């Protein structure tokens, strides 16, 4: 959740309908948009941010909602336009091969800047003490992780969470709607829409 990938999409035709084809028990909460009107507006670049946050912290992944995971790992301003999907994958992620495969951070010297990654290496500092790169009192690794055993409750299973950002800058006609066809019939006087002409 502290080191999240950011994929940059290019000119294409995004079909926002396969999002609800995966395994059940998945959220589709949007902010500022709607899935019914998703394929109506035009966006230049869409960014996908994948992270493995789980538990009762998906509700606080929203503009103006702090918490314990969206406080020093991911911050969203009050302008987010996208839909978050948090389907649960408790079949290929939770395994006994390794419990520290995923990571998780904690409090820092300051709050994270919205939409900024905080890949660090340095050890945490309590404010007044010599660390010297050792694991002692008041100097410990803030990357406190958790285990993933295939016996936990519903509130601790691996949740694959990915958010989508919708930007709108001075750009040409980029991704906007999958398509729209109506099985053209040629027998009478009827309306037509040939890619703009109405």
């Amino acid at each position, epitope marked *: 959740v502290y*080191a999240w*990938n950011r994929k940059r999409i290019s000119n294409c035709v995004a079909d926002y309908s396969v999002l609800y084809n995966l395994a059940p028990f998945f959220t589709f909460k949007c902010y500022g948009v709607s899935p019914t009107k998703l394929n109506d507006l035009c966006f230049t670049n869409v960014y996908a941010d*994948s992270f493995v946050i789980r538990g009762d912290e998906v509700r606080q992944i929203a503009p103006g909602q702090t918490g314990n995971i969206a406080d020093y790992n991911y911050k969203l301003p009050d302008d987010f336009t996208g839909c978050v999907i948090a389907w649960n994958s408790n079949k290929l992620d939770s395994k006994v*091969s*390794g419990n*520290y495969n995923y*990571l998780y951070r904690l409090f820092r010297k300051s709050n994270l800047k919205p939409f900024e990654r905080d890949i660090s*290496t340095e050890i945490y500092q309590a404010g007044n003490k010599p660390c010297n790169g050792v694991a002692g009192f008041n100097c410990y690794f803030p990357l406190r992780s958790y285990s993933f055993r295939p016996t936990y409750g519903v509130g601790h299973q691996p949740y694959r969470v990915v958010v989508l950002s919708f930007e709108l800058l001075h750009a040409p006609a980029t991704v906007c709607g999958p398509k729209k066809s109506t099985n053209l019939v040629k027998n009478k006087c009827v309306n037509f829409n040939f890619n703009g002409l109405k």
Partner: antibody, heavy 126, light 108 residues
Framework: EVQLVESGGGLVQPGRSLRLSCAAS????????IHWVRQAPGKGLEWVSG????????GYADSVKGRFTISRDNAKNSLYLQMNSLRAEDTALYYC???????????????????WGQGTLVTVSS | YELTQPPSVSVAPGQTARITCGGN??????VHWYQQKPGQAPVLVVY???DRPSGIPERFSGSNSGNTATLTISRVEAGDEADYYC???????????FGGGTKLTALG
């Protein structure tokens, strides 16, 4: 073509920490997995960790869990590996190996290295 | 997993060599090989026991049958003396299991 230059490495006291880097050049740092593998002098190699094309950890060894943390930075095209609580059995040539396949979405997990580098001698003693 | 390799295999430069890597039930998972010149960086050799990368001649070959993967190198020369390793995935433990490489030395 591919130039996997590796930076970071030297003499450090047992129990300290350091940051290793591997700046990629020649290919696209968004579709090829890069791993970390050490090689003790004249005592074979040993896989440390690795990350896929996206930000994803593929696991560690049976002796580096909890102490090592690998991170990927697609913006600067460089792979980083954090080492905590180094001991006497961590003196080896840590390499920066890439992957041949493009790691398509629907396949089977099978990673094999194709491009190798030179490595940095990370010696840990008093 | 745990792979077992011969500590050293020598052969005259007139015939082929026999480098094997055996395990417990390694009959379906892919078997990859590597060659590392002494001092230089490890180079890639025939992988998946069914194809070779670009640049490797036809002399290098591989084959797996049940619990033994044989890296059959043909017409071994002096410039082929290197440390050969075999790779496996072992998705059961989410690791990359290597093994003690074999020091191929052209005798004679």
């Amino acid at each position: 073509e591919v130039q996997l230059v590796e930076s970071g490495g030297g003499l450090v006291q047992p129990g300290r920490s350091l940051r290793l880097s591997c700046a990629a050049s020649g290919f696209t740092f968004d579709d090829y997995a890069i791993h970390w593998v050490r090689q003790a002098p004249g005592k074979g190699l040993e896989w440390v960790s690795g990350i896929t094309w996206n930000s994803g950890t593929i696991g560690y060894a049976d002796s580096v869990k909890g102490r090592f943390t690998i991170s990927r930075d697609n913006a600067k095209n460089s792979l980083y590996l954090q080492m905590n609580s180094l001991r006497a059995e961590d003196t080896a040539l840590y390499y920066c190996a890439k992957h041949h396949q493009i790691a398509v979405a629907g396949d089977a997990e099978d990673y094999y290295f194709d491009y190798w580098g030179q490595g940095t001698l990370v010696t840990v003693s008093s | 997993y745990e792979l077992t390799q011969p500590p050293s295999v020598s052969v005259a430069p007139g015939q082929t060599a026999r480098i094997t890597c055996g395990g417990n039930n390694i009959g379906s998972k892919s078997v990859h090989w590597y060659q590392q010149k002494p001092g230089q960086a490890p180079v890639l050799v025939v992988y998946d026991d069914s194809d070779r990368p670009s640049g490797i001649p036809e002399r290098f070959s591989g084959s797996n049958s049940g619990n033994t993967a044989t890296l059959t190198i043909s017409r071994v020369e002096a410039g082929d003396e290197a440390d050969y390793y075999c790779q496996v995935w072992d998705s059961r433990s989410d690791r990359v299991v290597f093994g003690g490489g074999t020091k191929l030395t052209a005798l004679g």
